[PDB]
Amino acid sequence: FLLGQSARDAERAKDILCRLEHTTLRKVTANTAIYYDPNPQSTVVAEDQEWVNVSPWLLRVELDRKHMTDRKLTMEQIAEKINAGFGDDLNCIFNDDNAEKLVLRIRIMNDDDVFLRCIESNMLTDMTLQGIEQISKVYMHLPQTDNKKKIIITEDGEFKALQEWILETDGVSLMRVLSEKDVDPVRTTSNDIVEIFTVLGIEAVRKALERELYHVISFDGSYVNYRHLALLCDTMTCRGHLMAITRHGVNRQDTGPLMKCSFEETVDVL
Amino acid sequence: PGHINCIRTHSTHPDDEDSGPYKHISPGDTKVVVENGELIMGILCKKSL
Amino acid sequence: SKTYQDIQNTIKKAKQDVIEVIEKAHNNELEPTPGNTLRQTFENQVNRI
Amino acid sequence: KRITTPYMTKYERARVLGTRALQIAMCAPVMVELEGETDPLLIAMKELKARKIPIIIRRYLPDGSYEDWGVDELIISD
Amino acid sequence: RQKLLKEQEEKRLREKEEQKKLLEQRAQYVEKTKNILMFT
Amino acid sequence: EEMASDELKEMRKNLTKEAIREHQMAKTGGTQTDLFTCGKCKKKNCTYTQVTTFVVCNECGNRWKFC
Amino acid sequence: EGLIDTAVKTAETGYIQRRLIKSMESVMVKYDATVRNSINQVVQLRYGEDGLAGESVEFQNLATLKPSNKAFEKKFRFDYTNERALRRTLQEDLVKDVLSNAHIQNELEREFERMREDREVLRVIFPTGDSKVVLPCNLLRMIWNAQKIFHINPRLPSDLHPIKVVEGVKELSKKLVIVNGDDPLSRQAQENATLLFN
Amino acid sequence: DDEEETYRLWKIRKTIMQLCHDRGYLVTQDELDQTLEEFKAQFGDKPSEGRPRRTDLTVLVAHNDDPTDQMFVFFPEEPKVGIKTIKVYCQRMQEENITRALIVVQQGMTPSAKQSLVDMAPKYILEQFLQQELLINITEHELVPEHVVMTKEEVTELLARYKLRENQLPRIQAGDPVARYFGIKRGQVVKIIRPSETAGRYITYRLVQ
DNA sequence: CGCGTT
DNA sequence: AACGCGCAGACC
């Protein structure tokens, strides 16, 4: 749930979405070709970019424009990261943001043939140009029910539900998502259980498990008394740790062998 | 039995009826209103039984 | 009878709509709905129709 | 200094009725005038209504203590 | 009305207590800052 | 971003708008009407879905069903 | 497809229910009015966070929830100034009393303050404004039965002094007890348990 | 980065101040909610080798009723804090009568440092917190209800009242984020207050073990 | 396999 | 240079 002014307008929410979603070179790149141009000033390709800027080999990694504009990146920071990631060992010449082709030139200075292949492969498979891991892709849907719209008691007294933008991710992090600015660090749940136990607390886990169980059981319109759900959650969160309902979670309690064998692992517990 | 009091809505009850007139006198014979254990108005269905 | 005529007209309209959706998808006009791909949005529109 | 609930739980009531019916079936002195019935369960129910069953329930608590209640002492539900 | 007035005066006394707490906090910070200075 | 030409700036703005529109999610469909009053916000606007007559609050967002 | 789905559902739900039952087959409410397992480990100080059975509970609405401040004020304040309305509702032997006696006026003002406090508590407790809540006794049905039995006839001036209603509600709240005990902690737990109902 | 580092430092300082206030350590109501303009104006807003350097923004707050009790909040610059740093901190702390401290590490301290931390425990209590966890306050989270660290007197009162052994109460490991937030340790009961939809408010207890 | 300590 | 551990992987 967006907290700042980004919650109302979508312009200042796309940036939050981009910074939360995982972007990599494999996403903002179109083609990659390894060339053996001997002299940098020779330039086997027709590109007037090295002479202005000034090893017998390089990699031309031409980036796409639409994806770069969607993620709102700049070759400056891309090159900064691609240099800081590998140290002061490479010299990645970038291109201005005026030409049509978003070409690059990765060169190494100080087996060498395959080294460029290996390095390009391991930077393309993962680089993290702007985003956090785990989170694959983030959505952007408006809240249609009261379970997500913002609620605020006006001066007159009425609740008056407000329709604010909200992002629906696909991974788990929470620790890194709540820290981002323009993100409500109060209403941003997680949908997972172990994640809430590691992030918030055992009591937050009990509340979250209750909500998820209620949701999955009331999704079909049915109704179950809250007492049964609360009792189940309490039995699961009594011993602090989230005791699993399976054998591995129930047979660990100090109940007794006559009761543990009644369930499972008969001969073992005996 | 007894003096039971309850109100229930019939299945084929138009929602745009309580707002307009004929609230306590439904033309379609809906709005089950039992008083002192005596059916007065409305038809019985799963919503009432 | 008249119910049958209405049902046949509705089915013919639905067929025409799905044929138009197919023609649009072939000629490349149906833009991808946000959050869904081209085939996904085509199937969604056909199913909704 | 008894803290348990003053009402008769359904479990206690059912068990007391069954036990009194069994004691009656084994030829035991009744605690109420019989109007003309012979079913021991019905006699136990009548005895419960009259509040004359000579039984006291020993309700145990989680700690280990126990409170002894009387059918004529605590209030009956049904 | 006099009851409202004495309630107002009690609120004023609470505000004075807030002021005295603030002045004590400042009087202790004026000395605690030296330990933070010598620490570095 | 500020030094680019007018055509380049217009293209960048259009691309950004297209990306923002595609990243969004399709709103849930339904028959919007003001005949049902939502008990969670007291508003009249809402949507109805027949499949079981489910009601989705429009402004307040009250969720309910009628049989 | 439907037949296969039914078969797999019947095959999985069986194991699910078996595990759910073996996890809590021992939990039970003790005579100390607290839920515990076979190891006497407290799972709930009071069953269902209230100490009430799930059978005698029905759905009801919270009247003081999601109101408009002005609507709530004019509906739950009992104006003891409109002598015409006071005569219309109560009787002459009570209008003069509610006008002269100021102790009654102070008591009603204190009652309204308590009503406002409970409304704020509900608002901060039930976010999103959900009036539908499960409670034991259905007070609306009870009031309706009382009317139909005693033949109230809603039209003539009734004979019920507000001080009587206030003292009756207070005595009833004192009677309904869950955590028996004059201890400060006992009283705090009793109040917290029967809060929503009161 | 410069601005981002300053924003993270400011957020961490705010979280530490709120944590200290919840535990009981008297903190200025001003610093308890200061914004970032004053943070800049006080420090410098040039963490990239400038004035706002770590170890200088450390804070020493004293407990409310016990002015003789205080606690430091260090901010080592070493990403992977070692043992020489904590050793020198304890050696410099040994001068004063303080006992409690709190380390805020950039990255996870080496396992060898935790050994010394628990070894120096009975004489000087010190616990570590990652910056990644301090950037957000979990107590203000919707799920996290209200917690209270009770005292031995009222704990014994509760036990004697309920005629229940402390071992029977629910459990909450000390490694719990909220437990570490409150600084509670083994053998201590925390009170939890929850909005129960079937009883307004519901109060429960959990012993740390 | 990597860090840090002895 | 060898040992204390911890994460990841592999294997059962």
Angle formed at CA B42 by CA B36 and CA B45, multiple of 5 degrees? 100
Angle between helices F6-23 and A11-20 (to 10 degrees): 70
G63: helix, strand or coil: coil
Tally of residues, chain A: 270
Is G137 strand, coil or helix? coil
Residue of F nearest to B45 (CA): F67
The Cα–Cα gap between A20 and A14 comes to 10
* 3-class SS string, H13-32: HHHHHHHHHHHCCCCCCCCC
Angle at F63 between CA B49 and CA G140, to 5 degrees: 50
**Burial class of residue G177 (count of CB atoms within 10 Å of its CB; 0-12, 13-18, 19+):** middle
Residue H6 DSSP SS3: helix
Instruction: Name the nearest CA neighbour of G44 among H205, B30, H173.
Output: H205
Do F42 and G66 count as a contact with CB atoms less than 8 A apart? yes
Cβ-contact G66, A153 below 8 angstroms: no
List chains touching B (3+ CB pairs under 8 A). F, G
- How are beta strands H59-62 and H171-172 bridged, if at all? unpaired
The single residue listed with the structure tokens 């959650």 is A233
DSSP, residue by residue, G177-189: -SS--SSHHHHHH
Considering only the beta carbons, identify the residue of E22, E25, E39 that sits closest to H58. E39
For the record, the structure tokens of A258 come out as 């006559």
> Phi-psi region for residue G66, left (φ > 0), alpha (ψ -120 to 50) or beta?
left
How far, CA to CA in Å, does G137 sit from each of B33, G61, G140, H198?
Answer: 21, 12, 9, 13
- Which helix (H) or strand (E) element contains residue G2? helix G2-24
Residue A257 CB neighbour total at 10 angstroms: 11
Tokens of H117: 């931390």
d(CA A124, CA A61): 10
| CA-wise closest residue to C14 among C37, C47, C38 | C47
CATH superfamily for H1-136 is: RNA polymerase, Rpb5, N-terminal domain (3.40.1340.10)
Q: How far is the CA of G102 from the CAs of E1, G73, G81, G116, in angstroms?
A: 15, 20, 12, 21
Which are the contacts of E28, defined by CB distance < 8 A and separation ≥ 6?
H62
Give the tokens for residue E18.
């807030």
Write down how long chain F is: 67
Q: What are phi and psi for residue H157, nearest 5 degrees?
A: -60, -50
Contact at 8 Å (CB) between B36 and B3?
yes
Q: What residues does each domain of chain H span?
A: 1-136, 137-209
- Mode of pairing for the β-strands spanning H188-196 and H200-208: antiparallel
Closest alpha carbon to A180 in G198, G178, E27, H135: H135
G168 inside 8 A of chain A by CB = no
- Judged by phi (left if over 0) then psi (alpha if -120 to 50, else beta), residue F31 lies in beta
CB within 8 Å of chain A, chain F residues 21-60: 23-28, 40-43, 47, 52, 56-57, 59-60
- CA distance linking residue H107 with residue H130, whole number of Å: 7
- How many Å apart are CA A80 and CA C40, to the nearest integer? 38
Experimental method: cryo-EM
Q: What is the number of other CB atoms lying within 10 angstroms of the CB of residue A42?
A: 10
How far apart are the CA of F16 and the nearest CA of chain A, in angstroms?
A: 5
d(CA G82, CA G86): 6
In sequence order, the 6+-apart residues with CB closer than 8 A to the CB of F36 are B15, F44, F46, F48, F55
* Bases of chain J with protein Cβ within 7 A: 4-6
Distance CA A19, CA A180 (A): 9
Helix axes G102-125, G92-100, angle to 10 degrees: 80
Structure tokens at A192: 């997972």
Q: Would you state the torsion angle of the CA atoms of residues F13, F19, F25, F31, taken in this order, to the nearest 10 degrees?
A: 50
How far does CA H96 lie from the centroid of its chain? 21
Place of tokens 């709540």: A178
State how far the Cα of H91 lies from the Cα of B10, in Å rounded to an integer: 82
HEC profile for A156-206? CCCCCCECCCECCCCCCCCHHHHCCCCCCCCCCCCCCCHHHHHHCCHHHHH
Instruction: In whole angstroms, give the CA distance from residue A139 to residue A17.
Output: 8
Is the separation of the CB atoms in A131 and F48 below 8 Å? no
CA gap H96, H70 in Å, rounded: 10
Is-contact G6 D38, C-beta < 8 A? no
* Per-position b or e across G85-107, b if 16+ CB within 10 A of its CB: ebeeebbeebbebbeeeeebbee
Tokens found for residue A234: 């309490």
Indicate which of F20, F25, F28, F49 best probes the interface with C, i.e. most C CBs within 10 Å of its own CB: F25
Beta bridge partners of H206: H190
For D53, counting Cβ atoms within 10 Å of its Cβ (0-12 exposed, 13-18 middle, 19+ buried), the class is: buried
Closest C-alpha among A131, A171, A166 to residue A27 = A131
State how far the alpha carbon of H137 is from the alpha carbons of A184, H131, H134, H142, H192, in Å. 12, 11, 7, 11, 17
Residue G35 has phi, psi (to 5 degrees) of -90, 130
Q: Any alpha helices (H) in chain A, and if so which ranges? A: 11-20, 25-28, 50-53, 65-71, 75-86, 112-125, 175-178, 194-199, 202-218, 226-237, 247-250, 257-263, 266-269
Secondary structure class of G40 (helix, strand, coil): coil
Helix (DSSP H) and strand (DSSP E) numbers for chain G: 8, 5
Give the minimum alpha-carbon distance from A8 to chain C in angstroms, rounded to a whole number. Answer: 19
Cα A230 from chain centroid (whole Å): 32
CA of H107 to C1' of I2 (A): 16
Give the whole-angstrom CA distance, residue A133 versus residue A171. 9
- Which of H138, H173, H177 lies nearest to residue A241, judging by beta carbons? H173
Question: Cβ–Cβ contacts within 10 Å for residue B23, how many?
Answer: 10
CB-based contact A94:A104 (threshold 8 Å): yes
Query: With 0-12 CB in 10 A as exposed, 13-18 as middle and 19+ as buried, what is G130?
Result: middle
Q: List all residues 6 or more positions away from B18 whose beta carbon is below 8 Å from its beta carbon.
A: none
Residues with CB under 7 A from strand I: H 80, 82-84, 110, 112
User: DSSP code of A42?
Assistant: T
Give first-to-last CA distance, chain B, whole Å: 14
Half-sphere exposure of A161 (CA within 13 A, CB side): 31
Q: D22 by DSSP, 3-state: which?
A: helix
Contact yes or no for G20/A228 (Cβ under 8 A)? no
Chains contacting D (3 or more CB pairs within 8 Å): G, H
| Beta bridge pairs of residue D68 | D58
- A36 marked among binding-site residues: yes
What DSSP string runs through H39-58? HHHHH-S--SSSSS-TTTS-
CA distance E15 to E19: 6
**C-alpha distance from residue A208 to each of A23, A201, A234, H148 (Å):** 30, 10, 12, 21
Locate tokens 């102790």: which residue?
Answer: G103
**D26 close to D34: Cβ distance less than 8 angstroms:** no
Burial of F38 (0-12, 13-18, 19+ CB in 10 A): buried
Q: Which amino acid is at A266?
A: T
Of A203, G147, G22, C38, nearest to B3 by C-alpha is G147
Partners of H148 in the β-ladder: H191
Instruction: Provide φ and ψ at A266, rounded to 5°.
Output: -55, -65
Strand I bases, protein C-beta under 7 A:
3-5
Burial grade of A107 (CB within 10 A; 0-12, 13-18, 19 or more) = middle
Give domain H137-209's CATH architecture.
Alpha-Beta Complex (3.90)
Q: Which residues of G22-47 are buried (b: 16+ CB within 10 A; e: fewer)?
A: bbbeebebbbbbbbbbeebbbbbbbb
Alpha carbons F55 and F65: distance in angstroms, whole number: 6
Alpha helices in chain F (DSSP H): 6-23
Question: Between helices H152-162 and G184-193, what is the axis angle to 10°?
Answer: 70
Distance from the Cα of G130 to chain B's closest Cα (Å) equals 21
Nearest in space to A14 (alpha carbons), one of A72, A75, A94, A82: A72
Backbone angles phi, psi at H187, to 5 degrees: 70, 60
Amino acid at position D16, single letter = V
8 A C-beta contact, residue F23 and residue C34: yes
Contact status, residue H100 vs residue H123, Cβ threshold 8 Å: no
| Nearest-angstrom CA–CA distance, G65 and G67 | 6
Pull the structure tokens for residue G20.
């759910």
- C-alpha dihedral (D34, D40, D44, D50), degrees to nearest 10: -10
Best probe of the E interface among H25, H29, H66, by most E CBs < 10 A, is H29
Write out the two tokens for H160.
């004697």
- What is chain B written as a DSSP string? --S--EEE--TT--STTSSSS-SSS-TTS-SEEEETTEE-SS--STTT-
Torsions phi, psi of H70, nearest 5? -135, -175
**Surface-to-core class of residue A68, CB atoms within 10 Å of its CB (0-12 exposed, 13-18 middle, 19+ buried):** buried
Domains, in order of start, for chain D = 1-78 (3.90.940.10)
- The helix/strand/coil state of H74 is strand
With H, G, I as helix, E, B as strand and everything else as coil, classify residue D78: coil
Query: What value does the CA radius of gyration of chain G take, rounded to a whole number of Å?
Result: 24
**CB G194 to CB H199 under 8 A?**
yes
Helical (H) or strand (E) element with H157: helix H152-162
Among candidate residues A207, A125, A162, A222, the one with its CA nearest the CA of residue A7: A162
Q: Which two tokens stand for residue A252?
A: 């660990």
Tokens 């055509």 correspond to F7
Supply A146's token pair: 């009261």
Q: Which of G137, G110, G115, G141 is nearest to G63 (CA)?
A: G115
Contacts of A251 (CB under 8 A, 6+ apart): A260, A263, A264, A265, A269
| The domain made up of A6-130 is a member of CATH 3.40.50.1860 | no
Tell me the CA distances in angstroms from D26 to D19, D20, D34, D40, D43, one per residue in order. 11, 10, 17, 9, 13
